Write a protein that binds this ligand. Structure first.
Ligand SMILES: Nc1ncnc2c1ncn2[C@@H]1O[C@H](COP(=O)(O)OP(=O)(O)OP(O)(O)=S)[C@@H](O)[C@H]1O
Ligand SMILES: Nc1ncnc2c1ncn2[C@@H]1O[C@H](COP(=O)(O)OP(=O)(O)OP(O)(O)=S)[C@@H](O)[C@H]1O
Ligand SMILES: Nc1ncnc2c1ncn2[C@@H]1O[C@H](COP(=O)(O)OP(=O)(O)O)[C@@H](O)[C@H]1O
Ligand SMILES: [Mg+2]
Ligand SMILES: [Mg+2]
Lengths: 50, 49, 348, 261, 164, 39, 319, 339, 261
């Protein structure tokens, strides 16, 4: 009855579900946090301009 | 045990192996290279194996 | 920058030993049409520094700067191989033995690019670029045939320098067209001279007894002597005549391996000796060096009639090691046959 | 069962020539109300909203709301053979893997039954809802494309700044500076050439030109165009065809790395 | 994804991604498995290296995966599978899916407190050794006993040449 | 990815505006994966 | 009116008609009965039933939808870098209405012949479109398939067919073809096909077409290997340390025109099942392997084979 | 492309006033003319005439009559008015990779006949020169078009063909001829050409050619124009083969006198006759089984000589290997004689 | 001794570009009635026949039958620099292996001359009996190239059928099956040609794209084309040039097998 592979059935949707390499996923998650912060700062600056 | 492992050295040295060992790098436990990436070109090998 | 390369001579006049050979190489350079060189001799003899002196005599001071470049060559079996390379404006240095049986995939191609550069680069100094070939004794039969055809094809284009330790594996065709430069190991007094000169240039003084002990422990290896002198400098600020020269760690590990082989002859001890040899192999120690060290440390405990049989067995299994691929089989096969023979000798 | 009969397919050929390089795939969201084509480009910065009324066809029939995704390059392949005076039929089964297009040549009997496999989109209609735009500008199409041509000769980033008199186009390039202004030409003979401004508050944005080239490659489809621009919303470029539907085109403005004080 | 894979049709891809590198305002990820590329590519990028994960952690993760699918397994079989697959998580997950949805390995009972019958034997069928042996035959039980009859001699030969 | 044609002028002229500009659809169905290609 | 080959005439149509590799065939059977098969790579020797099993699996999974939901690409097709990037990718993105648990199948027969760049492009397109499409690869040497392709699939292993299974299928073909036969001809057909079912069927059809009866002399007349009776007599002479008679047989084989390669191959194949002691068999196999390596390296003369017989004679004559 | 005008020009090419093409003088035209492999040509006729021709794999040592045989079958099956339209003869001489399989062969096999309706045939010469993946494509082409076209693969060594290609075809080995039946043909050509050969020269011709007709004609013709008469010394000197007297004297030196004198004599004879150690080893090995040795002596000599021949292959010093060859006899037979 | 006087260089230009990559060589055999050229593709799937009458040349004169075979790489390289409107002469010797092509002056100031070698091949007379064909149609020439380009750019093989309505071209490619039907009453206005049939029994066959497109490469030789098909007799496309003489192509259909159960 199932129709997808287990690699995408049990695909980690949240970064904490990655097994091992916790320093690497910590660095990547942190770096994307600064990039999302910069995107939100750009949006805030755009709305403050107008 | 010594006779068996002499026979195994006989097999490793004096018999043909299926996959040609140290084909692109040298033997095991080497530091100089070992980063043999696979092929990246669409032309065929045209080898005489 | 240790003492081995900080005080490496740069010209043929600053060499301390083989001075007649240095003058002969200078006269070779001054003729203007020096041939392919086949430099050979033991390790630590001084082949590389003499080749560097030859290169500095040929071209200007610009060979003293070096740069590392990586070359990715496509194999005819369509699997690209990337190798490192030390080079300069005037010379190239390569070690194609790192490419396994694809060493010819370097040899037929790499020097060709240099030949391409010889029709691309123009300097009006000399009509060739020197290609240095390190560990040419480790090439295969077809690699050496490729090298032969390569020096035939680009004779007037580039010159070849082949540095090796043994000319046994190289083919007689590759020797029939290269001038042979045999660099023997320096004597004990020569190593003492070099050690005293290197210590004086650093500002220290070492006694003649310590220098003689270092030269005797080096086994006529100048580089090993310099490294051991630097280690003795690290251990003690002044050089005393009774200062203990520190020993090589893998050498003493091989010595305890030989003692464990001699002490008990059991399958359990055979397994621990196999584990020790695996530990040495994982340290990138070459298996031929391990076999030579094992034979050197096992012949002390042997008896006179046993010595010839043990040496012949070690040579047999080292030839098997050369023929095969997984060297632990031949190493431990020699080991186990030695324990069997030694046990049979000790029961009678 | 979906069945549509474009009485004339010159406008279909010219709109696929307008959208031949921008969007990767085209979806049909086909209902009883009409035919919807909401397509997002490969860069996901622009959007195309092509809407065809049911009365704009000869016969239009749709039993159930359906959606198909085909690719643009195959549509470029089929529609090269389309003439300018010809009848075009679009046919689809109720639950089909394929879409048919019947091209009836002006000969007595020369039929091109051109069939094309669907390509299985996982994306539905995606667009902003109706919201009141501060600046609404009616302005001709040919001189829009002419302005885009000269400014694309000038530079690679424009500032669009609405004003009381019109809307100013500014650009700074390495060749020079290109600035153009728009004035009211409402007191003119043709209503297409007439320019009227319904601007409410002054906004300004930074845009990309090649996008304006695909924007304005839809030139001869409509006489005049309507620009809707407000605060922090995509530019809406609106072409209303006569009793034959209308198309909206959406630009997302370039981001600005604003510096603090 | 897979920046090290460059074809002749991908003309100037390295120059294009360098032009991307210079003139971007949004984050860019490069994913590769070739270790040389980080030395070959020129430019400023933050290096992130995924080391090989611990065998016990991925073994317990696959134990979780099989436990959710109402399958009970031992950690030793998973350790063998991951050692054979050199700790490839995707390859292990895919082979586990194939082997579970086929009906498991063999019905054997093992009492562990540390209950349905356990399902050891995944690494045996991973190498295709179940295609040679009868399903009542264990590999080590086959190796320990002496071999006399021609058919299991052929079985031994087939085992060794499949591993050769 | 390597499964699609990625030549330099192709990836430039079709993906610079993703980095240099905003997204037209900011709300709704956004966290998807459009694999870039040109058949 | 046309004579179909018995290889294709008696091809299995159902997955239960495939002999050998019972575990993997049964797993494929339950996947065909259930559905949701993952990406698979079937590796093994030729003639063992990999293409047949994949075709029967796809047929059972699809049925009437096999005409449009299946994309087969063998080595006679292009399967280039542009073919992988375009044709396979549009078939992967193609919409096909299928029952639940059924996916489109992309069979890539002879994935050894697939170029490395084609596989490198195949990686991601096999990974992402797995919700609607599946990949079934078949190969002989799995080492020729690059590592990410093996990582994105499930590797299934096929082995050589046991002579019992080849005998059962041979009886199945014989009892549906009115083929007169004897036991020695069956042993000869099984010997001439070492673990291959295609070679067994082709040799059976060739012997039936050439002579009409299945005995050993007919099989070896139409197949022309060095006769296993001669090689068995030579090995028996070497066991008794009779260099003269063993060399008489070897020189007779050499003057019949047989190459060194098939002579040493038949020597190994006869010696594998020869009835002698284990130590003598081990020394014989070691010396045969050394001589075979010497033949493969390039030195292949009667001196090499005479030196083998002699190394085989001195194995027994000396302790 | 091309590579066909040379053969067409070559077939009626002779000076016809001075040249003597002995090999091309006596060629069969049909299967009733090639008096060799009677079972093979009979079963080929039996396959063709009843419309059950299978895929054929013709192999064997070269010069045994394979290409002309299948040319005769193709000409007797298809008339000249329809021969080129439905018979496609290619080879590995025209190789640009593997394109020929997916090009001419795949196009030819996948279409019907043009003029006269029937089955088509592909001749493929030196098929062992193909790569493994080219054969993997060819077997698929053969498998899916077996009803329309049949294939005939002419190779030299069967070991270079993949097992599936051998599985699709029935194999025919063209062995060397029993040296006896070759003699009638040699008496025929000497009676035609009026030459002087003794029986010993006949023995030399049948032992040098190893069942090859063309090489026998070449050697006989060359020795005839060189000397005008053929005895064993005359053919062996023109051939540059180790003479039986020289090998017998080498064996006598290695059996009779000491190491140094035999070594000097053998080195002198090798430099004198241009003799290599490989051919010395071959002829001495042939001499070993015709000389009454004990079984242990024969086993020892064969093992040692095989080891020397292996050592010569890797490129060692020929002088030291010659000393080892002398040593192999000095170990056993000299002290057997002196006992 | 053979001499021919070709009136227009366009005829030889288009004839050489028609057979450009179809063929490996051209073996012209001369006769009192005219000159002939029959040969076959290296893949042995297509036949090219070309007959030129004596009266078509201005001065055609021959002594005895002789066949000359030239590889067309050299002659195509030579003939690519020939005038379209120029008048050409061809001259060969009785036994020499060199053939002379002399082009007159295109600028009325430089007469061009060139020579090619000769290689002999096994080219025997393929004496096909001209059986009565069950499907003979007449159809425009440029339209045939247009339709073959439309079909061959989607699929790999083109299916051509001739039913009671007329001819029908189909291609079930990996993109989607394209299909155009032509009829009896369908007459185009581009060339003012009407499709007419002389058919008895409907036949349906399938052919490769490349050889059919190489056949379309000979478009401007005639304003009309006759297509000839039968259940066995193969695909024939024939161009009847102005005055007399004709160009004749045979293509072998692919073998179609019934699907399995
Ligand atoms: N296990 C089997 N059971 C029954 N018949 C078999 C079996 N294996 C092979 N055959 C027969 O042999 C023919 C060829 O089998 P294939 O499946 O084509 O071999 P293969 O596994 O594809 O190996 P290749 O193609 O050389 S890599 C089939 O059509 C069957 O008639
Ligand atoms: N048994 C034979 N008796 C007489 N002449 C023979 C015999 N075998 C070959 N020939 C001659 O060899 C010529 C060519 O025969 P081929 O069939 O071409 O030989 P082949 O076996 O195919 O090996 P090749 O062509 O050299 S690779 C014939 O025309 C004969 O003159
Ligand atoms: N004439 C010399 N004077 C001083 N030091 C030397 C002299 N010759 C060699 N050396 C030292 O000995 C070492 C020899 O190493 P190298 O040149 O690599 O020889 P090899 O290639 O044989 O190992 C160098 O490190 C160098 O510093
Ligand atoms: Mg198969
Ligand atoms: Mg031949």
């Amino acid at each position: 009855t199932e129709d997808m592979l287990w690699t995408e059935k049990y695909q980690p949707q949240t970064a904490s579900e990655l097994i091992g390499n916790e320093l690497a996923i910590k660095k990547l998650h942190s770096w994307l946090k600064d990039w999302k912060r910069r995107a939100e700062l750009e949006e805030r600056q755009n709305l403050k301009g107008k | 045990l010594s006779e068996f492992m002499d026979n195994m050295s006989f097999l490793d040295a004096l018999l043909t192996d299926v996959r040609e060992q140290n084909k692109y790098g040298r033997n095991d436990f080497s530091w100089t290279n070992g980063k043999v990436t696979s092929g990246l070109c669409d032309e065929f090998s045209l080898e005489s194996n | 920058s240790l003492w081995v390369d900080k005080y490496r001579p740069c010209s043929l006049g600053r060499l301390d030993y083989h001075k007649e050979q240095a003058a002969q190489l200078r006269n070779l350079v001054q003729c203007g049409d020096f041939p392919h060189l086949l430099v050979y001799g033991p390790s630590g003899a001084g082949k590389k520094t003499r080749i560097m002196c030859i290169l500095r005599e040929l071209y200007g001071v610009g060979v003293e700067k070096l740069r590392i470049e990586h070359q990715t060559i496509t194999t005819p079996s369509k699997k690209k191989i990337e190798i490192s390379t030390i080079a300069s404006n005037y010379h190239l240095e390569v070690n194609p033995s790192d490419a396994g049986n694809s060493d010819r995939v370097v040899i037929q191609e790499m020097l060709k690019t240099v030949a391409q550069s010889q029709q691309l680069e123009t300097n009006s100094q000399r009509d060739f670029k020197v290609v240095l070939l390190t560990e040419v004794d480790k090439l295969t039969k077809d690699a050496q045939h490729a090298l032969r055809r390569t020096m035939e094809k680009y004779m007037s284009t580039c010159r070849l320098i082949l540095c090796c330790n043994s000319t046994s594996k190289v083919i007689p065709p590759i020797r029939s067209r290269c001038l042979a430069v045999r660099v023997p190991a320096p004597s004990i007094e020569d190593i003492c001279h070099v050690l005293s000169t290197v210590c004086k240039k650093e500002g220290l003084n070492l006694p003649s007894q310590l220098a003689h002990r270092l030269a005797e422990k080096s086994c006529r290896n100048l580089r090993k002597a310099l490294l051991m002198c630097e280690a003795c400098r690290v251990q003690q600020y002044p050089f005393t005549a009774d200062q203990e020269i520190p020993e090589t760690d893998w050498e003493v590990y091989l010595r305890e391996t030989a003692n464990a082989i001699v002490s008990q002859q059991t399958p359990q001890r055979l397994l621990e000796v196999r584990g020790r040899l695996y530990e040495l192999l994982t340290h990138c120690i070459p298996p031929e060096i391990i076999m030579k060290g094992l034979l050197s440390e096992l012949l002390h405990n042997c008896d006179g009639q046993l010595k010839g049989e043990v040496a012949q067995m070690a040579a047999y299994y080292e030839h098997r090691l050369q023929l095969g691929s997984k060297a632990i089989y031949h190493l431990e096969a020699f080991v186990a046959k030695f324990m069997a023979l030694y046990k049979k000798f000790m029961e009678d | 069962m979906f069945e549509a009969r474009l009485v004339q397919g010159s406008i279909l050929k010219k709109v696929l020539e307008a959208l031949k390089d921008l969007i990767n795939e085209a979806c049909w969201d086909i209902s009883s109300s009409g035919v919807n084509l909401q397509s997002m480009d490969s860069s996901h910065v622009s959007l195309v909203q092509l809407t065809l009324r049911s009365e704009g066809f000869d016969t239009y029939r749709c039993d159930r709301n359906l959606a198909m995704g085909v690719n643009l390059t195959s549509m470029s392949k089929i529609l090269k053979c389309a003439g300018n005076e010809d009848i075009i039929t679009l046919r689809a089964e109720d639950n089909a893997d394929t879409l048919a297009l019947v091209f009836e040549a002006p000969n007595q009997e020369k039929v091109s039954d051109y069939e094309m496999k669907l390509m299985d989109l996982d994306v539905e209609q995606l667009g902003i809802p109706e919201q009141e735009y501060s600046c609404v500008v009616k302005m001709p199409s040919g001189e829009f494309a002419r302005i885009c041509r000269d400014l694309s000769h000038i530079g690679d980033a424009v500032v669009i700044s609405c004003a009381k008199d019109g809307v100013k186009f500014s650009a700074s390039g390495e060749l020079g500076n290109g600035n153009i202004k728009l004035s009211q030409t409402s007191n003119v003979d043709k209503e297409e050439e007439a320019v009227t401004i319904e601007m409410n508050e002054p906004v300004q944005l930074t845009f990309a030109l090649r996008y304006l080239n695909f924007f304005t490659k839809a030139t001869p489809l409509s006489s005049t165009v309507t620009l809707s621009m407000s605060a922090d919303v995509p530019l809406v470029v609106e072409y209303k065809i006569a009793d034959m539907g209308h198309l909206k085109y959406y630009l997302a403005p370039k981001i600005e790395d604003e510096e603090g004080s | 994804e897979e920046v090290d894979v460059i074809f002749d049709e991908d003309a100037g891809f390295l120059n294009a991604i360098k032009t991307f590198m210079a003139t971007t305002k949004r984050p860019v990820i490069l994913t590769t498995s070739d270790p040389t590329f980080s030395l070959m590519f020129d430019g400023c990028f933050e290096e992130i290296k995924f080391s090989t994960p611990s065998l016990l952690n991925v073994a317990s993760y696959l134990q979780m995966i099989c436990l959710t699918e109402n399958f009970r397994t031992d950690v030793k079989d998973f350790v063998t599978l991951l050692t054979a697959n050199t700790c490839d998580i995707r390859k292990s997950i895919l082979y586990l899916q194939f082997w579970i949805r086929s009906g498991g390995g063999v019905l054997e009972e093992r009492p562990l407190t540390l209950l349905p019958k356990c399902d050891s034997g995944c690494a045996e069928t991973l190498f295709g050794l179940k295609n040679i042996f009868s399903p009542s035959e264990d590999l080590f039980s086959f190796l320990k006993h002496k071999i006399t009859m021609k058919e299991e001699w052929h079985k031994f030969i087939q085992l060794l040449t499949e591993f050769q | 990815n390597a499964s699609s044609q990625r030549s330099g002028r192709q990836i430039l002229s079709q993906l610079k505006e993703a980095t240099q500009s905003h997204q037209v659809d900011k709300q709704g169905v956004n966290s998807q994966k459009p694999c870039f290609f040109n058949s | 009116h046309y004579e179909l080959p018995w290889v294709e005439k008696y091809r299995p149509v159902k997955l239960n008609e495939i002999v050998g590799n019972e575990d993997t065939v049964s797993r494929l059977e339950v996947f065909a009965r259930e559905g949701n098969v993952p990406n698979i790579i079937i590796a093994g020797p030729p003639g063992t039933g990999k293409t047949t099993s994949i075709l029967c699996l796809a047929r059972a999974l699809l049925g009437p939808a096999l005409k449009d939901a299946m994309l087969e690409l063998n080595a006679s097709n292009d399967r280039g870098i542009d073919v992988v990037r375009n044709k396979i990718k549009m078939f992967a993105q193609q919409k096909v209405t299928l029952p639940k648990g059924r996916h489109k199948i992309i069979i890539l027969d002879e994935a050894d012949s697939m170029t490395d760049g084609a596989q490198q492009a195949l990686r991601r397109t096999m990974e992402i479109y797995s919700k609607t499409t599946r990949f079934a690869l078949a190969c002989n040497a799995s080492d020729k398939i690059i590592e990410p392709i093996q990582s994105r699939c499930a590797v299934l292993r096929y082995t050589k067919l046991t002579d019992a299974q080849i005998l059962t299928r041979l009886m199945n073909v014989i009892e549906k073809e009115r083929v007169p036969y004897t036991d020695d001809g069956l042993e000869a057909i099984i010997f001439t096909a070492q673990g291959d079912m295609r070679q067994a069927l082709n040799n059976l059809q060739s012997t039936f077409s050439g002579f009409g009866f299945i005995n050993s002399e007919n099989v070896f007349k139409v197949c022309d290997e060095p006769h296993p009776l001669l090689v068995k007599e030579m090995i028996q002479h070497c066991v008794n340390a009779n260099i003269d008679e063993a060399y008489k047989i070897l020189a007779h084989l050499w003057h019949l025109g047989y190459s060194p390669e098939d002579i040493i191959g038949n020597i190994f194949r006869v010696c594998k099942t020869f009835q002698m002691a284990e130590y003598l068999k081990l020394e014989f196999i070691k010396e045969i392997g050394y001589t075979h390596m010497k033949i493969a390296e390039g030195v292949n003369s009667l001196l090499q084979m005479a030196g083998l017989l002699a190394r085989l004679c001195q194995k027994t004559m000396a302790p | 492309m091309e590579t066909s005008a040379l053969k067409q020009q070559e077939q009626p090419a002779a000076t016809k006033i001075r040249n003597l093409p002995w090999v091309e003088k006596y060629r069969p035209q049909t299967l009733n003319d090639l008096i060799s492999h009677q079972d093979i040509l009979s079963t080929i006729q039996k396959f063709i005439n009843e419309d059950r021709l299978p895929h054929l794999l013709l192999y064997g040592p070269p010069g045994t009559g394979k290409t002309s045989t299948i040319l005769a079958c193709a000409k007797q099956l298809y008339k000249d008015k329809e021969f080129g339209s439905m018979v496609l003869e290619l080879n590995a001489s025209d190789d640009r990779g593997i394109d020929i399989i997916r090009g001419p062969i795949l196009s030819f096999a996948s279409t019907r006949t043009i003029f006269k309706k029937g089955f088509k045939l592909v001749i493929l010469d030196e098929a062992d020169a193909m790569t493994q993946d080219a054969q993997n494509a060819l077997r698929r082409v053969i498998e899916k078009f077996t009803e329309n076209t049949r294939f005939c693969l002419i190779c030299n060594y069967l070991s270079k063909i993949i097992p599936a290609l051998q599985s699709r075809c029935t194999r025919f080995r063209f062995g060397p001829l029993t040296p006896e039946l070759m003699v009638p043909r040699l008496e025929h050509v000497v009676e035609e050409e009026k030459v002087d050969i003794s029986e010993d020269g006949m023995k030399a011709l049948v032992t040098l050619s190893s069942g090859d007709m063309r090489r026998a004609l070449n050697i006989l013709q060359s020795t005839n124009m060189a000397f005008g008469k053929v005895t064993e010394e005359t053919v062996y000197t023109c051939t540059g083969h180790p003479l039986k007297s020289d090998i017998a004297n080498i064996l006598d030196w290695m059996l009779n006198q000491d190491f140094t004198t035999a070594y000097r004599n053998i080195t002198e004879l090798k430099t004198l006759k241009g003799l290599a150690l490989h051919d010395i080893l071959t002829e001495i090995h042939l001499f070993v089984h015709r000389v009454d040795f004990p079984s242990s002596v024969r086993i020892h000599l064969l093992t040692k000589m095989a080891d020397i021949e292996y050592r010569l292959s890797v490129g060692t010093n020929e002088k030291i290997q010659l000393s080892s060859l002398i040593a192999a006899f000095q170990v056993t037979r000299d002290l057997i004689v002196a006992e």
